Design a protein around this ligand. Structure first.
Ligand SMILES: N=C(N)c1ccc(CNC(=O)[C@@H]2CCCN2C(=O)CCC2CCCC2)cc1
Ligand SMILES: [Ca+2]
Length: 223
């Protein structure tokens, strides 16, 4: 997260860290047994870490639970990151509390200009590299599709939207991958891609979760 602020401990209780010896991606709790992340975050041997603030210090509200299965979207395309969504099942149900809470799936999409919350343990610099140990937050609006497509011609699908600031300086970044974009109390986006971080006229691109709600609901009821 570049240009954001410290969220504050467990102020984003649906935010998870995916860990395989180390944090490698964000995720969102959507019920006690299931997480939503990005397809480009797929790998075996995943441990889900909930209740986290400082990811390098055990502060007392953590729950560490291994993944029993992962389901990348059937239509994911690694070349273009179209349908960049994945579901991860917990081997045991998370114990939900104020610190470890699920985020609601959207009933409908969000419109351009809607303010959202983007969060993660990703890089905080526009040039160079600095990883925070505490959770960073960023308020950012959903941008119009035309400004999104103008920035990334021939690369944006109906399954993607841009959010952020065309002037730059505020954006998500590497290590934020898979993380939530929350608008009006719903999970509308997943941190997917972009050119650099916080670069002018290069806004962040997010997986459009509202297109996947039936697939999400169908998949977890059958797995
Ligand atoms: N500036 C941002 N908002 C932002 C946030 C998070 C990321 C992390 N994502 C990534 O690094 C993903 C993973 C595979 C290649 N990749 C890219 O961003 C490269 C460009 C992609 C590859 C294919 C279509 C465009 C990248 C950018
Ligand atoms: Ca911790």
């Amino acid at each position: 997260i570049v240009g954001g602020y410290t969220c504050g401990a467990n102020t984003v209780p649906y935010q998870v860290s995916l860990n395989s010896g180390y944090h490698f991606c964000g995720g969102s709790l959507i019920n006690s047994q299931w997480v939503v992340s990005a397809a480009h975050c797929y790998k075996s041997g995943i441990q889900v870490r909930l209740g986290e603030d400082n990811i390098n210090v055990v502060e007392g509200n953590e729950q560490f639970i291994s993944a029993s299965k992962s389901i990348v979207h059937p239509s994911y395309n690694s070349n273009t990151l179209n349908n960049d969504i994945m579901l991860i099942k917990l081997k045991s149900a998370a114990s939900l509390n104020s610190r470890v809470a699920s985020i609601s799936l959207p009933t409908s999409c969000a419109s351009a200009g809607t303010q959202c919350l983007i969060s993660g343990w990703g890089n905080t610099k526009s040039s160079g590299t600095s990883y925070p140990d505490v959770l960073k937050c960023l308020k950012a609006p959903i941008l119009s599709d035309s400004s999104c497509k103008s920035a990334y011609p021939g690369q944006i699908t109906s399954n993607m939207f841009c959010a952020g600031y065309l002037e730059g300086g505020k954006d998500s970044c590497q290590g934020d991958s898979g993380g939530p974009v929350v608008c009006s109390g719903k999970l509308q986006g997943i941190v997917s891609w972009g050119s650099g971080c916080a670069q002018k006229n290069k806004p962040g691109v997010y997986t459009k979760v509202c297109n996947y709600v039936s697939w999400i609901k169908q998949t977890i009821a059958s797995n």
